[PDB]
Enzyme design. Sequence first.
Site, mmCIF file in Angstrom:
data_model
loop_
_atom_site.group_PDB
_atom_site.id
_atom_site.type_symbol
_atom_site.label_atom_id
_atom_site.label_comp_id
_atom_site.label_asym_id
_atom_site.label_seq_id
_atom_site.Cartn_x
_atom_site.Cartn_y
_atom_site.Cartn_z
ATOM 1 N N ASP A 142 0.856 -1.166 0.000
ATOM 2 C CA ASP A 142 0.000 0.000 0.000
ATOM 3 C C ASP A 142 0.899 1.223 0.000
ATOM 4 O O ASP A 142 1.532 1.506 1.003
ATOM 5 C CB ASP A 142 -0.892 -0.031 1.264
ATOM 6 C CG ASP A 142 -1.988 1.021 1.313
ATOM 7 O OD1 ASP A 142 -1.943 1.960 0.499
ATOM 8 O OD2 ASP A 142 -2.904 0.892 2.165
ATOM 9 N N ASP A 153 -4.377 6.937 -3.045
ATOM 10 C CA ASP A 153 -4.293 5.906 -2.015
ATOM 11 C C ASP A 153 -4.764 4.629 -2.725
ATOM 12 O O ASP A 153 -5.940 4.494 -3.079
ATOM 13 C CB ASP A 153 -5.175 6.262 -0.798
ATOM 14 C CG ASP A 153 -5.015 5.332 0.390
ATOM 15 O OD1 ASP A 153 -4.191 4.378 0.302
ATOM 16 O OD2 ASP A 153 -5.737 5.517 1.386
ATOM 17 N N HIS A 222 -12.586 5.650 2.907
ATOM 18 C CA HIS A 222 -12.616 6.999 3.463
ATOM 19 C C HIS A 222 -12.550 8.066 2.405
ATOM 20 O O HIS A 222 -11.992 7.837 1.334
ATOM 21 C CB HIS A 222 -11.437 7.189 4.435
ATOM 22 C CG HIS A 222 -10.111 6.826 3.842
ATOM 23 N ND1 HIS A 222 -9.320 7.768 3.210
ATOM 24 C CD2 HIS A 222 -9.494 5.625 3.775
ATOM 25 C CE1 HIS A 222 -8.258 7.110 2.778
ATOM 26 N NE2 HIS A 222 -8.324 5.817 3.089
ATOM 27 N N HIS A 230 -7.263 11.049 5.161
ATOM 28 C CA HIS A 230 -8.612 10.746 5.614
ATOM 29 C C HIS A 230 -9.298 12.072 5.907
ATOM 30 O O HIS A 230 -8.992 12.696 6.912
ATOM 31 C CB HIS A 230 -8.582 9.881 6.885
ATOM 32 C CG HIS A 230 -9.900 9.249 7.243
ATOM 33 N ND1 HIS A 230 -11.094 9.936 7.115
ATOM 34 C CD2 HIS A 230 -10.163 8.011 7.729
ATOM 35 C CE1 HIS A 230 -12.040 9.099 7.508
ATOM 36 N NE2 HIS A 230 -11.528 7.930 7.895
ATOM 37 N N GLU A 252 -11.472 0.836 -0.204
ATOM 38 C CA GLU A 252 -10.629 -0.291 0.167
ATOM 39 C C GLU A 252 -11.402 -1.288 0.987
ATOM 40 O O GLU A 252 -12.273 -0.921 1.774
ATOM 41 C CB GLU A 252 -9.383 0.171 0.978
ATOM 42 C CG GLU A 252 -9.666 0.964 2.240
ATOM 43 C CD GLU A 252 -8.444 1.585 2.891
ATOM 44 O OE1 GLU A 252 -8.547 2.752 3.330
ATOM 45 O OE2 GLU A 252 -7.374 0.930 2.931
ATOM 46 N N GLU A 347 -7.299 -1.734 -2.933
ATOM 47 C CA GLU A 347 -7.754 -0.361 -2.728
ATOM 48 C C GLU A 347 -7.548 0.475 -3.984
ATOM 49 O O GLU A 347 -6.528 0.329 -4.665
ATOM 50 C CB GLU A 347 -6.951 0.261 -1.568
ATOM 51 C CG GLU A 347 -7.238 1.736 -1.279
ATOM 52 C CD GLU A 347 -6.498 2.280 -0.072
ATOM 53 O OE1 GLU A 347 -7.049 3.161 0.636
ATOM 54 O OE2 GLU A 347 -5.354 1.827 0.163
HETATM 55 C C1 LIG Z 1 -6.684 2.619 9.291
HETATM 56 C C2 LIG Z 1 -6.642 3.918 10.081
HETATM 57 C C3 LIG Z 1 -5.820 3.819 11.333
HETATM 58 O O1 LIG Z 1 -5.995 4.895 9.182
HETATM 59 C C4 LIG Z 1 -6.230 6.253 9.317
HETATM 60 C C5 LIG Z 1 -7.101 6.807 10.261
HETATM 61 C C6 LIG Z 1 -7.225 8.184 10.347
HETATM 62 C C7 LIG Z 1 -6.501 9.001 9.507
HETATM 63 C C8 LIG Z 1 -5.651 8.456 8.554
HETATM 64 C C9 LIG Z 1 -5.523 7.070 8.430
HETATM 65 C C10 LIG Z 1 -4.559 6.509 7.424
HETATM 66 C C11 LIG Z 1 -4.856 5.853 6.235
HETATM 67 C C12 LIG Z 1 -6.125 5.394 5.631
HETATM 68 N N1 LIG Z 1 -7.225 5.594 6.333
HETATM 69 O O2 LIG Z 1 -6.119 4.840 4.520
HETATM 70 N N2 LIG Z 1 -3.680 5.569 5.565
HETATM 71 C C13 LIG Z 1 -2.606 6.070 6.290
HETATM 72 C C14 LIG Z 1 -1.251 6.053 5.997
HETATM 73 C C15 LIG Z 1 -0.395 6.575 6.931
HETATM 74 F F1 LIG Z 1 0.933 6.564 6.677
HETATM 75 C C16 LIG Z 1 -0.855 7.165 8.099
HETATM 76 CL CL1 LIG Z 1 0.264 7.848 9.241
HETATM 77 C C17 LIG Z 1 -2.210 7.222 8.360
HETATM 78 C C18 LIG Z 1 -3.102 6.674 7.444
HETATM 79 MN MN LIG Z 2 -6.820 4.174 2.556
HETATM 80 MN MN LIG Z 3 -3.993 2.759 1.478
#
Ligand SMILES: CC(C)Oc1ccccc1-c1c(C(N)=O)[nH]c2cc(F)c(Cl)cc12
Ligand SMILES: [Mn+2]
Ligand SMILES: [Mn+2]
Length: 366
Positions: A142, A153, A222, A230, A252, A347
């Site tokens: 990812d 993403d 998201h 997000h 995703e 995703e």
């Molecule tokens: C699954 C959850 C814990 O992820 C989040 C929740 C809130 C805000 C952002 C993310 C997030 C996502 C994403 N939701 O896909 N992908 C990320 C890549 C990263 F490197 C970091 Cl630090 C943060 C994210």
């Molecule tokens: Mn994501």
């Molecule tokens: Mn992702």
Amino acid sequence: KVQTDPPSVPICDLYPNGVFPKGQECEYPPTQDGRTAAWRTTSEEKKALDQASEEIWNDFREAAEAHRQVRKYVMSWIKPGMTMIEICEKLEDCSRKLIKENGLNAGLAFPTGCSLNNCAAHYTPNAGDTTVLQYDDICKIDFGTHISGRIIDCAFTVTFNPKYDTLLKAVKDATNTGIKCAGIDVRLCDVGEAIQEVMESYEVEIDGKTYQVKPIRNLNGHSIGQYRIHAGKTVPIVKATRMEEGEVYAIETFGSTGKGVVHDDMECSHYMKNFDVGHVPIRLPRTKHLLNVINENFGTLAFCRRWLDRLGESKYLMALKNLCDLGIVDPYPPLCDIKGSYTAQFEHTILLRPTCKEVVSRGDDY
Ligand SMILES: CC(C)Oc1ccccc1-c1c(C(N)=O)[nH]c2cc(F)c(Cl)cc12
Ligand SMILES: [Mn+2]
Ligand SMILES: [Mn+2]
């Protein structure tokens, strides 16, 4: 100018007029009543509203073309025996070149996730990590690219043993269902219900054991905002808010042979500044220097410890812990299901354009 093998030519050098290839264009699905939302494809009021934001869609497309070329390159060499660090560094080196890294204006949106087996998300090696990719591993690649904060993403799962083939097929089908059911005015809970229904219709057998594939209920799609991975809206992957015109979503899904719930596990590698915190004055020297390194190089985009190491930074763990304790930076530790379980992920980033739904990160691979 033609692309090299291995890829080294930036995407803006392959399309110098700044017009980048479009992703998969899809007509909007009909509403719950039965009436189609398709009229948008020919609405002149929507055609003008879509052509005004052409620059934005174009930035997404340059980042999606870099994503497509990077992942095709990765698929040609990713092999068991390599260290996780070697895989992440080789992917990221190619990603920086093709996106033509330029501070906060173009670069990597977030660290390369390469989560293994029961760990579904947010694992990237820190320095000293000796972990090696194994023949029987199920690896979730990812990674993200961006042009002017327009984030792609997008993710896929890598395997070498054909025993996971049906688990992969189940997650790919569930992601593709979430993408088909997405559209302007569609409720987010309905996209979730459709994803779950497809995912749970699969049963798989791995090493003499059988499982009904489960969506990871606490992981989800998201909305995406500028420099904000997000943006606040959640697309569940299990059974109130509606998708809106102009919005951008990461669709995703994650399937698991375990409990279908993830917990914080192992050492943290992923960190990201809280998007809503303003300026905070810091006197602690190491803490102040690290916050300045973060604001300069990453801003509100995510980062990892390996990225601090490559910038010549050292003795930053306590300073990073202080920023985390203060609520300025948030840690995002690996998210893992029960030991012995297997997880898979697919995703895509989708653009909710006034005229059509664009699966901007779609390729000839997935
Ligand atoms: C699954 C959850 C814990 O992820 C989040 C929740 C809130 C805000 C952002 C993310 C997030 C996502 C994403 N939701 O896909 N992908 C990320 C890549 C990263 F490197 C970091 Cl630090 C943060 C994210
Ligand atoms: Mn994501
Ligand atoms: Mn992702």
